Amino acid sequence: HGFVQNIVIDGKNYGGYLVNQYPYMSNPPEVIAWSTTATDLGFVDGTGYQTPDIICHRGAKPGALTAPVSPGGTVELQWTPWPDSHHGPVINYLAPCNGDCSTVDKTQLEFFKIAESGLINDDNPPGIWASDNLIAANNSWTVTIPTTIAPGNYVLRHEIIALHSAQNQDGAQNYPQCINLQVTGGGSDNPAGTLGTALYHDTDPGILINIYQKLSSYIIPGPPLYT
Numbered sequence: 248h249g250f251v252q253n254i255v256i257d258g259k260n261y262g263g264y265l266v267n268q269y270p271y272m273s274n275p276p277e278v279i280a281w282s283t284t285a286t287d288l289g290f291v292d293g294t295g296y297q298t299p300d301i302i303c304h305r306g307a308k309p310g311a312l313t314a315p316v317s318p319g320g321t322v323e324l325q326w327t328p329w330p331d332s333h334h335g336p337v338i339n340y341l342a343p344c345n346g347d348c349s350t351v352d353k354t355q356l357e358f359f360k361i362a363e364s365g366l367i368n369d370d371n372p373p374g375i376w377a378s379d380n381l382i383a384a385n386n387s388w389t390v391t392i393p394t395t396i397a398p399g400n401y402v403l404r405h406e407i408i409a410l411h412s413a414q415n416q417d418g419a420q421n422y423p424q425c426i427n428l429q430v431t432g433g434g435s436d437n438p439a440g441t442l443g444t445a446l447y448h449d450t451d452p453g454i455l456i457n458i459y460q461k462l463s464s465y466i467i468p469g470p471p472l473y474t
């Protein structure tokens with residue numbers, strides 16, 4: 248359990264959607280991060296993959312603001328402390344807003360994968376995963392925005408999937424966190440995008456998996472990495 252408390256871009260903090268504060272507030276602040284109703288700090292499991300919930304987490308609505316990013320710039324996402332138990336991949340996607348991200352129909356966003364990290368080492372099952380890399384980085388993840396994509400407004404969908412329960416049908420725990428970015432620079436690619444509700448299926452080989460046994464490979468779920 249947890250969520251993104253803060254985002255660092257070009258030497259300032261953009262405060263995240265504080266799901267354990269702003270839903271109790273009823274005149275909460277304008278932020279670059281999407282609001283959610285996920286006040287339990289929990290997840291979208293396999294029962295929700297073909298529901299709107301998977302796109303930017305449960306009952307999610309677009310952030311009011313958008314952060315500019317320098318060409319090939321870094322986005323740093325700071326999480327609440329991530330439990331070692333919650334072993335699994337860290338995956339990042341962009342979807343174009345084609346306009347102000349604050350007014351998009353989330354059910355219409357088409358995501359391309361810009362980065363993925365899975366099982367790093369399996370010397371001691373269940374092993375070292377992207378999630379353990381995230382813990383070792385003091386619960387922060389650094390995304391580099393590609394220089395080769397068309398500039399304009401996009402949603403960054405940033406996700407940990409915990410696999411500690413994933414042996415069981417619908418046991419995997421997806422923690423998607425969305426923010427609004429204004430990508431800048433000279434790129435022109437419009438990558439093939441995948442609907443939120445076509446990212447994952449509850450029987451994917453990297454979703455329905457016993458991590459506690461020796462693994463020879465791990466298939467990072469979702470569509471193919473853009474480069």
Ligand SMILES: *[C@@H]1O[C@H](CO)[C@@H](O)[C@H](O)[C@H]1NC(C)=O
Nearest residue numbers: 379380381382383384385386
């Ligand atoms: C994270 O920072 C704290 C101090 O703020 C430090 O004590 C901790 O051990 C650091 N990093 C890791 C990888 O544990």
Ligand SMILES: [Cu+2]
Nearest residue numbers: 248249289333
């Ligand atoms: Cu949890």
